[PDB]
Amino acid sequence: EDPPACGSIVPRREWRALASECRERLTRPVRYVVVSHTAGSHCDTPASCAQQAQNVQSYHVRNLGWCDVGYNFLIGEDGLVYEGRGWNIKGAHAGPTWNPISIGISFMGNYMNRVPPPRALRAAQNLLACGVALGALRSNYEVKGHRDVQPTLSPGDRLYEIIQTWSHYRA
Amino acid sequence: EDPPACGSIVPRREWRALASECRERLTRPVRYVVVSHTAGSHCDTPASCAQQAQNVQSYHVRNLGWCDVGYNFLIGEDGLVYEGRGWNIKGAHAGPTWNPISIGISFMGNYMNRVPPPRALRAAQNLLACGVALGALRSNYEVKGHRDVQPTLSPGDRLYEIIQTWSHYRA
Amino acid sequence: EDPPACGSIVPRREWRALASECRERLTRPVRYVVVSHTAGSHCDTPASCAQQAQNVQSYHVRNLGWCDVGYNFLIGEDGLVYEGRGWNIKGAHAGPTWNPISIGISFMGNYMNRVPPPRALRAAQNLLACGVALGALRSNYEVKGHRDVQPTLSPGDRLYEIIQTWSHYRA
Amino acid sequence: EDPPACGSIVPRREWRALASECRERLTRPVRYVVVSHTAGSHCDTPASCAQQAQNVQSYHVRNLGWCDVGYNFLIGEDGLVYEGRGWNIKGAHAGPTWNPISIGISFMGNYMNRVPPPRALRAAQNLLACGVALGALRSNYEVKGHRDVQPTLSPGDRLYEIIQTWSHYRA
Ligand SMILES: CC(=O)N[C@@H]1[C@@H](O)[C@H](O[C@@H]2O[C@H](CO)[C@@H](O[C@@H]3O[C@H](CO)[C@@H](O)[C@H](O)[C@H]3NC(C)=O)[C@H](O)[C@H]2NC(C)=O)[C@@H](CO)O[C@H]1O
Numbered sequence: 009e010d011p012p013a014c015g016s017i018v019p020r021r022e023w024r025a026l027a028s029e030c031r032e033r034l035t036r037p038v039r040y041v042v043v044s045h046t047a048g049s050h051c052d053t054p055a056s057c058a059q060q061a062q063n064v065q066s067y068h069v070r071n072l073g074w075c076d077v078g079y080n081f082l083i084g085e086d087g088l089v090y091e092g093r094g095w096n097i098k099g100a101h102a103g104p105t106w107n108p109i110s111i112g113i114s115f116m117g118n119y120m121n122r123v124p125p126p127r128a129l130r131a132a133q134n135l136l137a138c139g140v141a142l143g144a145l146r147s148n149y150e151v152k153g154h155r156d157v158q159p160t161l162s163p164g165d166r167l168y169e170i171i172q173t174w175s176h177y178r179a
Numbered sequence: 180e181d182p183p184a185c186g187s188i189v190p191r192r193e194w195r196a197l198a199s200e201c202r203e204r205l206t207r208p209v210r211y212v213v214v215s216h217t218a219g220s221h222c223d224t225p226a227s228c229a230q231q232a233q234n235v236q237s238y239h240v241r242n243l244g245w246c247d248v249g250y251n252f253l254i255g256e257d258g259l260v261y262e263g264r265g266w267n268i269k270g271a272h273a274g275p276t277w278n279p280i281s282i283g284i285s286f287m288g289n290y291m292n293r294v295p296p297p298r299a300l301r302a303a304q305n306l307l308a309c310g311v312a313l314g315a316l317r318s319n320y321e322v323k324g325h326r327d328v329q330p331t332l333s334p335g336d337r338l339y340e341i342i343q344t345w346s347h348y349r350a
Numbered sequence: 351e352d353p354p355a356c357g358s359i360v361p362r363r364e365w366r367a368l369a370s371e372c373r374e375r376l377t378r379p380v381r382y383v384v385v386s387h388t389a390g391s392h393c394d395t396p397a398s399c400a401q402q403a404q405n406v407q408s409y410h411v412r413n414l415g416w417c418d419v420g421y422n423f424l425i426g427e428d429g430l431v432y433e434g435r436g437w438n439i440k441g442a443h444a445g446p447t448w449n450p451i452s453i454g455i456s457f458m459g460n461y462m463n464r465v466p467p468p469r470a471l472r473a474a475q476n477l478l479a480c481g482v483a484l485g486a487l488r489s490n491y492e493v494k495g496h497r498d499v500q501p502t503l504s505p506g507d508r509l510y511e512i513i514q515t516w517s518h519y520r521a
Numbered sequence: 522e523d524p525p526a527c528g529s530i531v532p533r534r535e536w537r538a539l540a541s542e543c544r545e546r547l548t549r550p551v552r553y554v555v556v557s558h559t560a561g562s563h564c565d566t567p568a569s570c571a572q573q574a575q576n577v578q579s580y581h582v583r584n585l586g587w588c589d590v591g592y593n594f595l596i597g598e599d600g601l602v603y604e605g606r607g608w609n610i611k612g613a614h615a616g617p618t619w620n621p622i623s624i625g626i627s628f629m630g631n632y633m634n635r636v637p638p639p640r641a642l643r644a645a646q647n648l649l650a651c652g653v654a655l656g657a658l659r660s661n662y663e664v665k666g667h668r669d670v671q672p673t674l675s676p677g678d679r680l681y682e683i684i685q686t687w688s689h690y691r692a
Contacts, residue, residue: 009377011346012297012304016186016258022297053224054258054298087187087225088258088298127225127259130187137184143490210542210588280542319447319586328544346450349545389674410672420672443672446617501581501591502673503560 015131015138017081018090023058025065030075032098032108037146040110041136042102043171044154045163050085050117052125057084060116065092074100079114081135087127089135095144102157110152111145119164129170136176150178185309188252188260194229196236199247203269208317211281212307213273214342215325216334221256221288223296228255231287236263245271251282252306258298260306261287266315277328282310290335300341307347322347356480358473359423359431365400367407367433370418374440374450379488382452383478384444385513386496387505392427392459394467399426402458416442421456423477429469431477432458437486448499453481461506471512478518492520527651530594530602536571538578538604541589545611550659553623554649555615556684557667557675563598563630565638570597573629587613592627594648600640602648608657615670623665624658632677642683649689663691 020028046064051057061084065077078100082090092114093099101112113132115124139145153171154162156179163171171177191199217235222228232255236248243249249271250263264270272283284303286295310316322345325333334342342348362370388406393399403426407419420442421434434454435441443454455474457466466474481487493516496504505513513519533541559577564570574597578590591613595603605627606612614625626645628637652658666684667675676684684690 011377012301013308014305016298016301016305018258018298052226054296055223086257087189125225126193127187127189134185134187141184276544317586414670414672499585501559501585 014142015089015135017135018054018058018088020091023061023090025062025077026069028076028093028097030093030097033096034098034108034111036095036143038109038111038139038144039146039150040106041145041149041151041176042106042110042112042154042157043115043151043163043167044079044101044112044160045115045117045119045167046082047118047162048116052085054084054086054088057086057088057090057116060084061090061092064116078112080111081113083113083115083124083128083132083135085117085125085128087125087131089131095139095142102154106157111139115163115167119167120161121166122164123166123170133174149176151176152178181312181314185312186260186305188262188306189225189229189232191262194232194261196233196248197240199264199268201246201264201268204267205269205279205282207267208314209280209282209310210317210320211277212316212320212322212347213277213281213283213325213328214303214322214334214338215250215272215283215285216290216338217253217285217287218289218333218335219287221293223256225257225259228257228259228261228287231255232261235287239271249283250285252284254284254286254295254299254303254306256288256296256299258296258302260302266310266313273325274329281323282316286334286338290338291332292335292337294337294341304345320347321349323349354483356476356483359433359477360396360400360403361433365403365432367404367419368411370435370439372417372435372439375438376440376450376453378437378486379491380437380451380453380481380486381488381491382448383481383487383491383493383518384448384452384454384496384499385474385493385505385509386421386443386454386456386502387461387509388424388456388458389460389504389506390458394427396426396428396430399428399430399432399458402426403432406458410442420454422453423455425455425457425466425470425474425477427459427467427470429467429473431473437481437484444496445500453487457505457509461509462503463508465508465512475516491518493518494521522656523654525654527654528602528648530604530648531567531571533604536574536603538574538590539582541606541610543588543606543610546609547611547621547624549608549657551608551622551624551652551657552659552662553619554658554662554664554689555619555623555625555667555670556645556664556680557592557614557625557627557673558632558677558680559595559627559629560631560675560677561629565598567599567601570599570601570603570629573597574603577629581613592625594624594626596626596628596637596641596645596648598630598638598641600638600644602644608652608655615667619665619670624652628676628680632680633674634677634679636679636683662689664689665691
């Protein structure tokens with residue numbers, strides 16, 4: 009297996025995820041990381057956030073027909089990172105141009121009129137940091153916002169502002 | 180001189196901790212980690228676990244007259260690591276012959292008849308990987324139960340038999 | 351993909367190896383590889399080398415009471431590789447710290463004053479490429495000399511000199 | 522349980538040992554003694570031997586990151602006995618199974634080709650009677666050679682040849 013490490017990720021089974029059915033693999037090492045917000049309900053507790061990860065994947069699978077939840081990872085306001093498709097399966101979160109080359113991470117909540125908690129922001133930079141040590145993320149990765157790659161109000165005005173402060177951020 | 184990738188930790192200020200007055204330092208890199216429990220109330224949300232961290236620091240400072248919360252780090256059932264004395268300052272968890280040469284991390288609860296949740300064990304484990312990365316812990320660090328070094332039930336029968344299965348455990 | 355394409359290993363039965371009794375397992379992909387030497391005599395032909403794998407095993411099972419020969423794999427100077435405990439079973443070749451997290455491979459002979467023949471060094475390097483192909487070793491695994499983790503002269507001055515050269519050597 | 526001032530053992534401070542960090546205890550009376558050699562360069566003076574004792578500890582502590590030199594006592598060709606981990610701390614000389622139930626004395630030098638001088642042999646035997654008088658060793662203790670418990674050339678051929686004759690040896 010993988011003795012409980014990296015960025016404290018809540019595994020798929022722990023948030024009661026329907027089994028993935030995706031097979032498109034992503035080209036390690038990855039250059040881009042796109043940050044989006046789900047624009048759904050936000051939660052703060054491990055209990056409420058697992059239920060939300062479940063709810064997001066369910067909308068992507070039962071309704072949109074996708075092979076699994078779109079994002080490679082979801083960040084809850086509880087400060088935990090939720091495993092979506094992982095570092096190896098091409099996501100689906102920023103269109104055909106970016107899905108095969110960037111890793112998508114999504115903040116659960118609407119951040120148009122709100123900001124995620126520091127802990128959520130920590131879990132997120134931390135998550136990327138742990139990407140690098142695995143080979144999934146190339147040490148000198150670039151971070152784009154959803155707006156920057158596709159006409160979307162995502163990840164929200166207030167969260168978008170913060171994303172720009174980040175070091176690895178490109179234009 | 181390696182200061183990158185590693186874990187997220189709720190910092191002192193975020194859990195509204197009274198300032199530390201401790202000043203004696205540990206010698207890097209530390210060889211031992213001693214795991215304990217607080218035999219106190221458990222908490223399963225970021226807000227409830229901050230209150231709890233606070234109640235532990237409180238009792239150690241206001242009642243036992245220590246310079247700060249006794250432990251170097253505490254773990255919450257919410258899956259987050261709470262900062263205590265940190266990697267560099269000598270804790271006050273395991274007696275006078277062990278405090279000078281070890282990091283003491285304590286799970287917040289009474290583990291005698293319950294096990295902490297996977298997210299807790301996961302956080303505790305990343306934390307240790309981090310200490311190694313930062314160079315605060317020897318690469319071949321050794322994990323010990325509180326009871327292995329002091330006469331006590333800490334960290335509780337259940338959590339005790341769990342940590343015995345840890346890669347770094349050495350009776 | 352690229353169908354396996356590795357493995358010219360003389361199996362247990364081919365060298366007559368007493369049945370193994372060991373049951374404890376390694377978890378793949380393994381990260382470390384420890385190179386040792388038998389310090390005993392060498393062999394330079396198939397029945398000759400097959401004779402030693404049997405002696406070496408006899409010494410570990412009969413004289414020390416172990417469940418099987420210590421190494422995961424032995425390297426004869428006939429240029430063949432001999433199945434030891436293999437890729438999945440915990441060896442006994444480099445102490446309680448490294449045995450559970452490494453594959454021990456030992457050159458049959460004593461390389462303090464001499465080197466193993468090119469054939470032998472190829473058999474060894476090729477064996478490792480194989481381990482990676484099978485997912486039994488981390489693509490970025492590390493090669494340590496026995497003396498780098500245990501107090502011994504193993505694997506002999508000259509051979510130690512050679513492995514320090516290997517791509518995956520990390521002292 | 523009488524005196525005496527048995528054994529003229531050179532204390533750690535006198536050969537300038539680095540502070541030990543070991544804390545695991547041996548339970549007295551210890552039933553076994555394991556004889557090894559350091560397989561290295563030898564010394565025939567109180568001056569060079571104190572130096573060799575230093576080197577050996579340096580290897581175990583700086584290269585191998587151990588809590589102290591591995592043996593409980595070291596015997597020099599100068600006819601003296603250097604304190605290692607002493608009678609009460611569990612050594613790191615012959616593996617997980619024998620370390621907790623034995624005392625490991627080691628002769629400084631390589632004895633595959635030479636026998637150690639009578640005064641080294643005298644130091645060793647007296648060391649052992651001493652352990653019995655203090656009650657650290659059972660009066661009926663058994664002497665095993667290093668190669669009899671772990672795969673190794675240690676204690677070297679000629680010396681292995683000698684300890685096999687000893688009153689307290691046991692197959
Ligand atoms: C994975 C997923 O389904 N995510 C959904 C979120 O993307 C969605 O946020 C809203 O997405 C829509 C686009 O699908 C954004 O709308 C577009 O905005 C542009 C201008 O920026 C406009 O020109 C488009 O016409 C408009 N299209 C639509 C349908 O509105 C919208 O601005 C995003 N709003 C926010 C707050 O992110 C949320 C909305 O609840 O649902 C997710 O499932």
